[PDB]
């Protein structure tokens, strides 16, 4: 159905900043939910930041909650997870992701849909 | 045929000037009150959203051809999609009377919520734009449909219902940059 | 019309052409009108297409005018009155009335058109427009405006909701 | 009467379905109803 | 009582082996006035006459199943072909007329149909041709076979350049036996007239 | 009975021709509008999929029925198994038309979606075959009933409502390799 | 008929036995026939099926046919026109009239017949049809071409869909 | 008051400076139908429509008697063309209309005539120049001119490869003059259209 | 009607269920029913 393309990956150091984005390759007209897993080297996957479409609705996780920002683009219908002051524990496999079937807050970092393969993302010291 | 071209006086010439013949047609589609009928969506929404017919986007079937009238009356239709109890509040309501459940409150079924509600603004007709203020760009406050308010609302859509339009506007199609046409992919089978 | 203007202006040249244009409401000269505004949200029309051409010279000033209708079948349209005689046409020179209407045809195939061009595809499924300038008098500067309203017959057809939101 | 496809009357009354108008006009139908046609001057047919 | 005289504008064509005349799928023409072309159209009765053209060799050494069709309209150099390169739109039906002429000493038969929206045939469909206004041609019994098609399409006109509704086809069904007395080749043609032309949209010149 | 068989007069002798005598019968089921009212299956399905009825497989009752005339007409009706939202836009329309709400969406109930399509070809009939092109093996591109779109569609059912056929073509059996007919394994209870 | 041919050709030999086939719409004669193409997708039939044979041989060359329908019963259909002589049959020469049309009756216990023929079983549940060439006077390789139609009380009953897709 | 608009065919033409319509000879066509051509005739309708020629400059320096011909039937392109080309004995009638547009701050005059039986004419008898249908343009008052003549000829059918029965003539009658408010030149166009054109006698083709 | 078989009428009018057809004949039918039966020349029952 849906494929998901990421960009804006790569390397970086401490102090600096990356910027992530996902586009999906159909644009129907749903309310789905962007999120950014990572999965850090030798770890489980686990939620960093989602938006929802219809408004700018922000979740975030208690690691990241200052320092990461994520907007989405309605023109371009793209989504974009801005990385700031990176800590060397961000070093992980970042991986996008979908969720069409239901919109609701309190639900919005539990089941998502399609995936993408991730990208991958080694800051250094 | 010719005619005075300054005195503005509509002219209507038909195939019927070289030998043609003006052929029957039917206007079902471009009728007013047929047009505006259809759910059109809504993509800003709170926790508390005042239903304003000036929020639908500019450039839509309905958003459009609402912005290419003056003045409009219409009831209302909503398709909201909310966790919780929805309230609905009508034109003038405190922002305090959308907790209680002495006004339309719907206790959420599975997919989502479908009502209709009335027009209660307090003026013979809404308008799309305004030229001057109502205190003592920005439209007056009390060119609204009421509000509702849910814990959080995920999608809000809605259809107006006996749409009566007046006083038309200017209404603009997409520019072409340097081409003889705009051309654009249309839909044809595979292979 | 070219530089963005609604009008034509007679040329001190041996090019007789003042403008030629698509039969589609989707053309370049018609995107800034009220009939191709409505025929954006639509899928397929039929009917008549009114024009109407109103000079704007001095009175001091005389003009011959012509308009034909090419329909499709030839690849290039013509650039010569001499050899657009043979299609549908109108002449009409300037005096009191200073206002002029002609009502392009709906010759087709099917039943209906679509109020849509498909793709980089050339040679626009319905013909083109052409004004030309028969000849003038002392009219060097002077101006032809064009506007388009829709006809007796016409009609849209299958509403839709086109445009990236 | 725009875009409603059923036969049967509704359930519930006039009332409550949608307001009701009070009293105390198509314009543009009219506009273009009494558009000029024909010709002007003499013709040669 | 098998002499057949038809008459197309100012063209004859008399047979005395006639069969019979086919009508296929209509005994005449529908509205040829409609709404697409919005009343600016016109008939021309001078085109509506015949032309001859040259469609196979009947040889002694072509099977069953051995197909030549012509696509209608064809390539024409009188008044029809200038009505085709100088109006954007036409329609007319066809009134078609093929001869095979050998002696009544031969034996064989030919499948004569007019197949609408021509597609190539496998070798199992050619046993289902008869599903087409036809008629056969037997040299036992006649040399000539008629049909007369309407006009028909997706569209109630047609641009030529681009469509071709019509197609003539002749199969050979049994292969032709000669002996010493009877003609060892036979040469086949076609006798073509448009029926009810219908023009729309004249076109600019090219001088 | 014998009869001119060049003329190509059609022919139906009796068993009174010796004696016998004919049968009432009833064609029901060999109705043109009967046959071609079922659903059937297309299973060349996308993300976006473009209605096109010479999709079906050839070799099915209603694949096979249909590619056995030239022309025809018919309304339609889909049953779409989808996941979100499935929009359905009209013959003509751009492709960029699918993303927007405000054409024909369906919000997706549980099992799947089963909604009926009217006929909105410009043709007044549409062709299994085409001799020649469109533009200036494949049929023209507006030979379709509009176009669906979803996030994935997994399953799509068409049916042919007040059917109409033209002008019949060659509709061929499978074919018997060296046998005397050709035997196949017909239904029959156990033991 | 054998070699995929139309039609079946007079012989020079002691044998008379034009073409047999089995009275089925799965037959190997009629496989390619529109009647066998509509009754693969129906479940049971009923009714007349009819025959017709057109002589394509030259003015000096006569024979004479016959046609005979032989219901189930025996093991193996018969090879002679005298001992198939005392079945349903008809016969017919050659002259001016070049067609002739034969009605295959429908003979059964059921009111209904299978469109298809089961397994491996043999011995077709209808009977078959078989041609004969009583005399030919100078027909060496003239043909005689065989076709055919549904009757007039002829019925199919039962759709389905049968094919592998 | 003086609005005329002209329909031949599927094109019109309309001016505002219109003084009249001049009919030559003739208000309409005799019979079309003669012993001639033997039943064997048929009207063609669209070929009767408009088309466009250029005629010549008028400037200041041309003198009175300075005269300009277009021999009918011109060079045609389009319907009329394959006509003349494709049967070989037509006959038809003319409806002309000159257009000499300036401004109303010129002078000068123009004679328009149609002459049958074209010859040249001497110095001295281009006084005599309105015995023929015609009118005349004057930038004071018109800036066109509208003649409608038959067929006429010592023949009912005509071979027109090989005659032109008429011949459109424009005579500068008054030299232009012109002032610094004024069009310093004048370009004169014809708009010609055929009228009940007959034909008879098909040709065989090229291709 | 082909393939309908409830008796009550439809919910939805008849401008909504499916597409109008405008106006401005089976070939095979008559075609059919206009063959040729009986026999040629004499019968000798």
């Known amino acids: 159905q849906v494929q998901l393309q990421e960009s804006g990956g790569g390397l970086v150091q401490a102090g600096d900043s990356l910027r992530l984005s996902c586009v999906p390759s159909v644009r129907t007209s749903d309310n789905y939910i962007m999120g950014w897993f990572r999965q850090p080297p030798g770890k489980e996957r686990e939620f960093v930041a989602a938006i929802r479409r219809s408004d700018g609705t922000t979740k975030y996780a208690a690691s990241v909650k200052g320092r990461f920002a994520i907007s989405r683009d309605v023109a371009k219908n793209a989504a974009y997870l801005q990385m700031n002051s990176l800590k060397a524990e961000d070093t992980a496999v970042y991986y996008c992701?979908?969720?069409?079937?239901?919109?609701?807050?309190?639900?919005?970092?539990?089941?998502?849909?399609?995936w993408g393969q991730g990208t991958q993302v080694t800051v250094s010291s | 045929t010719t005619s005075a071209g300054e005195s503005a006086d509509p002219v209507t010439t038909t195939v019927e000037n070289y030998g043609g013949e003006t052929q029957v047609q039917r206007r079902h589609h471009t009728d007013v009150g047929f047009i505006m009928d259809r759910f059109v969506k809504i993509n800003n929404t709170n926790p508390t959203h005042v239903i304003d017919l000036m929020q639908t986007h500019q450039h839509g079937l309905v958003g459009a051809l609402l912005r290419a009238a003056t003045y409009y009356f219409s009831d209302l239709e909503i398709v909201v999609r909310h966790e919780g109890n929805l309230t609905w509040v009508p034109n003038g309501a405190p922002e305090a009377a959308l907790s209680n459940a002495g006004n339309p409150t719907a206790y959420n079924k599975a997919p989502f919520t479908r009502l209709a509600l009335p027009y209660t603004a307090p003026h013979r007709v809404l308008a799309t734009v305004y030229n001057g203020t109502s205190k003592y760009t920005q439209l007056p406050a009390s060119f609204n449909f009421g509000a509702i308010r849910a814990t959080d609302i995920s999608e809000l859509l809605v259809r107006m219902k006996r749409a009566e339009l007046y006083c038309p506007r200017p209404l603009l199609a997409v520019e072409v940059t340097a081409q003889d046409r705009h051309k654009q992919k249309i839909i044809a089978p595979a292979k | 019309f070219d530089d963005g203007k609604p009008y034509v202006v007679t040329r001190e040249d041996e090019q007789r052409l003042l403008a030629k244009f698509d039969v589609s409401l989707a053309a370049k000269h018609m995107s800034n009108t009220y009939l191709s505004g409505i025929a954006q949200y639509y899928a397929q029309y039929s009917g008549t297409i009114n024009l109407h051409f109103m000079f704007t010279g001095s009175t001091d000033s005389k003009a011959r005018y012509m308009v034909a209708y090419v329909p499709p079948g030839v690849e290039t349209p013509p650039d010569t009155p001499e050899r657009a005689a043979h299609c549908i046409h109108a002449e009409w020179d300037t005096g009191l009335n200073s206002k002029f209407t002609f009502s392009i045809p709906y010759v087709s195939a099917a039943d209906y058109a679509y109020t849509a061009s498909d793709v980089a595809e050339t040679t626009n499924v319905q013909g083109w427009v052409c004004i030309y300038q028969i000849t003038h008098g002392k009219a060097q500067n002077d101006t032809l405006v064009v506007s388009v309203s829709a006809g007796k017959d016409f009609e849209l057809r299958l509403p839709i909701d086109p445009r990236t939101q | 009467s725009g875009n409603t496809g059923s036969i049967i009357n509704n359930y519930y009354m006039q009332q409550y379905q949608n307001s009701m108008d009070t009293q105390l006009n198509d314009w543009f139908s009219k506009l273009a109803s009494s558009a000029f046609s024909g010709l002007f001057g003499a013709l040669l047919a | 009582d098998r002499t057949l005289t038809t008459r197309n504008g100012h063209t004859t064509s008399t047979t005395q082996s006639s069969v019979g005349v086919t009508y296929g799928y209509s005994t005449g023409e529908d509205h040829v006035s409609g709404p697409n072309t919005s009343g600016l159209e016109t008939r021309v009765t001078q085109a509506e006459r015949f032309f001859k053209k040259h469609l196979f060799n009947w040889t002694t050494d072509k099977p069953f199943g051995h197909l030549e069709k012509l696509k209608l309209p064809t390539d024409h150099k009188g008044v029809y072909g200038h009505l085709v390169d100088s109006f954007a739109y036409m329609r007319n039906g066809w009134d078609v007329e093929v001869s095979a002429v050998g002696n009544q000493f031969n034996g064989g038969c030919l499948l004569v149909a007019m197949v609408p929206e021509w597609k190539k045939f496998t070798p199992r469909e050619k046993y289902q041709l008869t599903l087409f206004p036809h008629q056969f041609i037997s040299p036992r019994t006649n040399m000539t076979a008629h049909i007369t098609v309407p006009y028909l399409g997706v569209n109630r006109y047609d641009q030529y350049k681009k469509h071709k509704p019509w197609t003539l086809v002749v199969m050979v069904v049994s292969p032709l036996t000669t002996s010493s007395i009877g003609a060892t080749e036979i040469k086949v043609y076609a006798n073509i007239a448009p029926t009810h032309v219908h023009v729309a949209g004249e076109l600019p010149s090219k001088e | 009975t014998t009869s001119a068989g060049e003329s190509a007069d059609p022919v139906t002798t009796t068993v009174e021709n010796y004696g016998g005598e004919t049968q009432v019968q009833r064609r029901h089921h060999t109705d043109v509008g009967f046959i071609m009212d079922r659903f059937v299956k297309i299973n060349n399905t996308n993300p976006t999929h473009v209605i096109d009825l010479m999709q079906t497989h050839q070799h099915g009752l209603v694949g096979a029925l249909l590619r056995a005339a030239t022309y025809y007409f018919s309304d339609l009706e889909i049953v779409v198994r989808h996941e979100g939202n499935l929009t359905w836009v009209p013959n003509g329309a751009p492709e960029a038309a699918l993303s927007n709400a405000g054409n024909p969406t369906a919000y997706n109930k549980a099992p799947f979606t089963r909604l009926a399509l009217p006929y909105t070809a410009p043709h007044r009939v549409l062709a299994t075959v085409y001799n020649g092109t469109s533009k200036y093996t494949q049929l023209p591109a507006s030979f379709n009933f509009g176009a669906i779109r979803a996030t994935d569609i997994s399953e799509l059912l068409v049916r042919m409502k007040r059917a109409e056929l033209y002008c019949p073509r060659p509709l061929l059996a499978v074919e018997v390799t060296a046998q005397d007919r050709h035997k196949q394994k017909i239904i029959a209870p156990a033991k | 008929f054998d070699d995929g041919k139309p039609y079946v050709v007079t012989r020079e030999d002691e044998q008379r036995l034009l073409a047999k086939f089995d009275v089925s719409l799965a037959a190997k004669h009629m496989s390619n026939t529109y009647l066998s193409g509509i009754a693969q997708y129906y479940a049971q039939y009923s009714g007349t099926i009819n025959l017709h044979f057109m002589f394509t041989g030259s003015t000096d060359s006569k024979a004479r046919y016959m046609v005979a329908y032989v219901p189930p019963g025996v093991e193996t259909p018969p090879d002679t026109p005298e001992r198939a002589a005392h079945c349903i049959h008809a016969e017919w020469d050659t002259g001016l009239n070049s067609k002739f049309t034969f009605s295959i009756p429908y003979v059964s216990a059921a009111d209904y017949a299978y469109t298809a023929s089961d397994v491996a079983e043999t011995t077709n549940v209808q009977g078959w049809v078989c041609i004969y060439q009583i005399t030919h006077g100078k027909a060496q390789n003239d043909t005689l071409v065989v076709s055919v139609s549904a009757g007039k009380d002829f019925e199919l009953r039962l759709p389905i869909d049968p094919r592998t897709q | 008051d003086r609005t005329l608009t002209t329909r031949n065919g599927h094109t019109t033409s309309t001016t505002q400076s219109s003084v009249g319509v001049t009919y030559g000879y003739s208000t309409g066509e005799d019979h079309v139908s003669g012993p001639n051509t033997s039943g064997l005739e048929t009207r063609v309708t669209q070929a009767e429509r408009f088309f466009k020629k250029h005629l010549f400059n008028w400037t200041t320096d041309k003198p009175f008697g300075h005269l300009e011909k277009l021999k009918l039937p011109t060079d045609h392109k389009g319907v009329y063309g394959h006509l003349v080309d494709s049967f070989a004995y037509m006959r038809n009638g003319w409806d002309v209309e000159v257009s000499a547009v300036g401004n109303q701050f010129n002078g000068g005059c123009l004679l328009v005539a149609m002459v049958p039986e074209w010859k040249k004419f001497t110095p001295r008898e281009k006084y005599q120049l309105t015995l023929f249908p015609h009118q005349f343009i004057s930038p004071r008052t018109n800036m066109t001119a509208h003649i409608t003549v038959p067929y006429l000829g010592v023949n009912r059918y005509d071979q027109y490869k090989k005659h032109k029965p008429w011949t459109l003539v424009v005579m500068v009658v008054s030299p232009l003059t012109t002032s610094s408010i004024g069009a310093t030149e004048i370009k004169v166009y014809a708009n010609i259209a055929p009228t009940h054109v007959h034909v008879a006698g098909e040709l065989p083709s090229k291709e | 009607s082909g393939n309908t078989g409830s008796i009550i009428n439809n919910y939805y009018m008849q401008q909504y269920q499916n597409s109008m057809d405008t106006q401005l004949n089976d070939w095979f039918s008559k075609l059919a029913s206009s063959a040729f039966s009986g026999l040629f020349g004499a019968l000798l029952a």
């Open positions: 992701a979908a969720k069409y079937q239901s919109t609701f807050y309190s639900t919005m970092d539990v089941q998502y849909d399609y």
